[PDB]
Amino acid sequence: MIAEIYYERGTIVVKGDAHVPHAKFDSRSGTYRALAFRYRDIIEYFESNGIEFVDNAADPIPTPYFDAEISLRDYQEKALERWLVDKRGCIVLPTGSGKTHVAMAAINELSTPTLIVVPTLALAEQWKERLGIFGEEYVGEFSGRIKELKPLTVSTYDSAYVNAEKLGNRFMLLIFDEVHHLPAESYVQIAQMSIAPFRLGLTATFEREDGRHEILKEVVGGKVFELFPDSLAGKHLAKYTIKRIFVPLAEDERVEYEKREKVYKQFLRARGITLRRAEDFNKIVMASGYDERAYEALRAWEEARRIAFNSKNKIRKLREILERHRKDKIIIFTRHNELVYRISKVFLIPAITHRTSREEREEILEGFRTGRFRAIVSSQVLDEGIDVPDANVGVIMSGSGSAREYIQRLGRILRPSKGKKEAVLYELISRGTG
Template sequence: MTDEPSETADSDDSDSDGDSDGLTLAQFHEASQREGRPVLTAGAVARTLERSHDAVSEQLDRLAERGDLERLSVSTDPVVWYPSELEDLTDKERVVVFPKRREIVVDRPDQFTRAQLAQFAHLEDGNGEQGYRYVVRPEDIWQAPHDSFEALARTMRQALGQRNEQLEEWVESQWDRAHQFRLYTHEDGYTVLEAKSPEVMGNIARQKLDEEHVHAPISETEDWVREGSEAAIKRVLYEAGYPVQDHRDLESGEDLEIDLEVTLRDYQQTWVDRFAEAGEGVFVGPPGSGKTVAAMGAMAHVGGETLVLVPSRDLARQWADTIQEYTSLGPHQIGQYHGGQKNVRPVTIATYQIAGMDRHRSLFDDREWGLVVFDECQHVPSDVYRRSTHLQSRHRLGLSASPIREDDRQKEIFTLVGPPIGTDWQALFDAGFVAEPELEIRYVPWGDDEQRNAYVSAEGREKYRIAAENRGKVDEIRYLLSAHPDSKALVFVDYLEQGRELSDALDAPFISGETRHHERRRLFDEFRRNERDLLVISRVGDEGIDLPTADLAIVASGLGGSRRQGTQRAGRTMRPAGGALVYVLATRGTREEDFARRQLQHLGRKGMTVREQTVERTEDESKRESEETAEDDSEDADGGDIVGERESEPEPER
C-alpha cells in the first residue's frame, strides 16, 4: 500500500462502511496504514484515531458482525483485528476512498476497475507493488466521457464498489462547472459565447473577459465574440475553473475516404471512440503505445482532409511513411511542407515553425481541414508553436507521451487542443503492449582531480556543466556497453563537446542539430536495419525519432532538463519487445544526483521500477582511468571545440 498521510480522526471517508458516527472500514484501513501493519489491536486503533478504547472496541465488534473484520485471540493481547478480505488477499482487490483529498488507493485492481477509474481519475502513483493511487482532478471530471452526471456516478460506483456521497457531491459540482459556458455559431456566421445563467455570465465571464475577447453583449447570457479570440476565451475561462464547450459549426473540409489497414488494440479503439464523442482531445500514452496509429484511426473516423503538425522534418517524413503503410492513402494524397519540400495535399504533414510563419500561413488558412493533428503537443503553449493553433478545423487531436511543462503551462495544452484521453501506463505494461524498461541511476565518481577541483570553484550553470561532462562517465559507458554486448544502444548527451568526445572514444557516430538531415536519416535507417548498434545522440533524439529496436539507453548528461525530457529519453526503449534498460549517469556528490532523482521520480509514479546504484572504483581502475584521461586530453588539445557548447532546439525552418 502507498504510505499516504492520514486525515483527522473525525474523517468520514465512507458512508457505507459503518455508522456515520462510528468506526468505518476505511478508517480501520487508515489506522492500518499509519501503524504499518494490517493486524491491529483495539488499543492501537484507538490510539491512532484518537478515540476511547471502549468506544473503539464496541465499533470493532459491530464491523465484525457485518463481516468486514475478523477477530483473532492471541497470547499477547486478548484480541487482534484484521480486514476479512485478508483471508483471500491474493486474488481480491481492495479500494479505499479518501474523499477530502479526492484520492483513491487500490490494491490489486482488476482490468475492469482500472478501466472504470480511468474515466474519472488520474493515476498519480502506479507502483503496483505498493498499490495504485488515483487522484480525482477537476480536469478529469470536465473531460469524463459521459452524457450526464448520473452516468458518470454509475461508473464511479462500479469502480469503487460503493457510493461515496462526499466525493460524488464534489464531482457533481465539477460536472456543473463544465457545462456553464459554450461557444456556438450564430445564424449570421459569427461566434457567440453563451452562459447557462445571467449570474454566471455576469460574475465570471464578464469579469474575466474584456474588449480583446468580445465585441458587446447580445443578451443577459450571450456575448458577441471577436473573430480569432476563441482560443483565448477558452483558456481564460478554463483557468478560472470553467471549461468551455465548443459547439461551433466549423468547416469540415473536403471528404476524404480513409481506410485503416491495421486492427486497433482495444485501448486504442477506446481512445478513438472518446475522441469521436468529444470531437477533440489529446491522446496521452507512453512511447510505443501506438498513438500515431490511433491518430490514423481518428483520421478514418473524421473522413476529411487532415493537417498534421510536427516539430521536425524528420518526424514529417516518418509520418508520411507510416500513413502510407497503415492506411489506404497513396503517395499522391500525402504531402509534406517544411524546409525540405513544400507540397499541400489532402493529408499534409507540416512543421510547427512553417505553419506559424506569415508567408506560409495563408496556404493552410485557405484550406478547410476536417482534422488538425498536433504531434508532440506539449510544445503548443510555447510562443513559437502556439500560432499554429489559430488554424481552425472541425476536429483537433493532440498526441503526447508527457503533456507536462516545467513552466506549468500544461493546462493550455488542453484548452488549445482538447481534453486528455489515455490509458494508465501500468495497464499497458501489464498487458504486454509496451515493455516496461528497467531504470537505474548510477552515481559515478570523478574521472580526475582537475574536473573535481573545477567543480568546487565553479558557480551556477558552469557547475552543472562540469558535472555533466565528468570524464569518469566515459569509462562507465564503456563498462555498460561491455556488460550488454548484444544490445543496440543509444547514448544521450546535452553538450556538443561531450558528444564529440564520446563519439571518438566509442567509435560511434554523433547525431546533433548540426548533422545534415540526409546524413541523420541515413544513420537512423542503418540503426533500424541492425547495420549499426550504437549511436551518440544530442537533444534531436528526445522526441519523435522512431528507433523501435533500441533496447539500451545511457543518459550521459541532460539531468538538468525537464521531466518531459526524462520521459522521452526513457521512452526510446519502450516498445513491445521486453528487456529494455535505461541507465542514467550522475556525478556522485554533485547537483546531478538531485536532478536525476527529480527527473525520474514521475516515471516511478507511472509504474516503472527505478533503482539507484553507487559506482565504486578500485585503485587500479582509478589509475588506469587517469592515464586514459591524460591521453585523451593530449589528443584533444588542438580540437578547438567551444567549451560548454550546449545542444539547442532544432534549427528553425526556412
C-alpha cells in the first residue's frame, strides 16, 4: 500500500503512513489528518525522506507563465529577494512604499495560481486592475458578487473565509494585503485550510494590540523584511528601477534542458536538497568534490545552465528592448563570453570581453562617451574610478537564476536621463523549473 494524500475540507487526509508530521489520527474516520497549510511540510517530508506518495490533495487552477514587466525600486528588490528565500513571510512597509509592486513581482516570478485576500471590494477592484498587466482573461474575483476561479483571483477576507474549503486546494500562492487582519480567529482559517505552499503578507503595521500577530509565523510567516518611514527619507537610490523579464526557452531548447536536469535532480548518490534545500551555493559545497564518478551527473547542471544563457528568446527579446531603447546609452553585462560574442555580432555591437586588452577599452568607452555610441556589450562592471560613460539603460543577460550582485554593481554606473531621472536595469531570466 503506497502513501497517498488528498484534500478534504480544509485538511490533508493521509493514507499509508502513521508517522507523517503534524498528521494526527481521525478516530471518527480512521485516517490521519492535518490542517491544509501543513501540505508543504508533508510534501517536503515525503521528499527529503525519499518516500513514495500520491498527491491527490492539490488541484491547481492551471496557470500560464507570466511575463509582465514590473519596475522595482532598490529597497523593493531587497524585500522581494528576502521573501524569495522561503516564499513564506510578511513584508512590512509604510503606505506608498509600493508593497503591491513586490507582490506583483512575486506573482510574476512564481507564476502559480494565486489568491489575493483583501479587506474591501474597492481594494479588490484596485488589485484586479493592477493584475491586468498579466492579462485580464486570467484575473478573476471570487466573492459574493461573482465567483470566478482564474489563476489570479482576488477575494475579500470575508468571502475567502466563507469558502475556505472550496478555495483550499486551488491555489499555490496566497497574498494577504494588510495581513494584520488575518489573525482574526476566523480569517486565520483561510490560511490554515489552504495547501498554498507560498504565502506573502503585506502590511505597514505587523504587531497587533492583542499579540495575536504571533500566529502568523506558523500559518503565513513572520517579518522577513521591514522598514519604518524614517528610513526611506534618505536620498536613496531612486536613480534607477529594476524590471526582470522571464523568457521561456523555445519548444526544443526546453526539451534538451530536460535531458540535462533530471540528471542532477535525483542528485545521484544521495538525498540532497529534494525541495529547495540550497541556493546554488550547495552545487559547489560538498558538491564539486571529485571522489567517485557519479558526481559527473552534476556536469549536466553545468550544462543546463548554458542551455539557458545561449537562448533565442533572450536575443529576440533583447532585440525588442534595443529598438525600445534606441535613443539611450545602454550597456549589456553578462557572465558568458560565449554569450558576449553572440550578442556582439547579431546586433553588430562593439564588445569588451575577458580577452580584449588594456588599450582595447580606453577608446570604446570614450567613443561610448563621445557619441555615435549609445549601446555596447561588455562582460565586467565598468566601475574603476569616478568616471565611465553615463549608461541610460542597463541590461543583464542571466540564465535560470538572478545575479543580484551585478544588479547593484551595474545599477549605480547607470545614470538617469536628465529628463526622466531613473535609469532602467533589465535582467533577462529563463524559466524551466526556476
